[PDB]
Amino acid sequence: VLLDPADEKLLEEEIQRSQQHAKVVPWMRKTEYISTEFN
């Protein structure tokens, strides 16, 4: 069919948030779990 991504987007009604999870915040690290490969 003759169709474009610009047309595709228009078929939806409303689909198109909280972005602060990925903040730097030099006082906040990440977590650590149980591997089977370590010192």
Added chain:
Amino acid sequence: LNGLTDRDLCELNECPLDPGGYFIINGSEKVLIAQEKMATNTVYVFAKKDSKYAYTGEC
């Protein structure tokens, strides 16, 4: 249990996290607590005024 891998420690049924540093004596884990003491070979001076001495040097 020295220079021994996590695989091997697990296969010995022993903990990889166990620090070490203790003895097994009749199947009891024993630690030697580090007893502190005055340093050897080093002169000190104190006032034991409660005596014939105004000052005592010690070694």
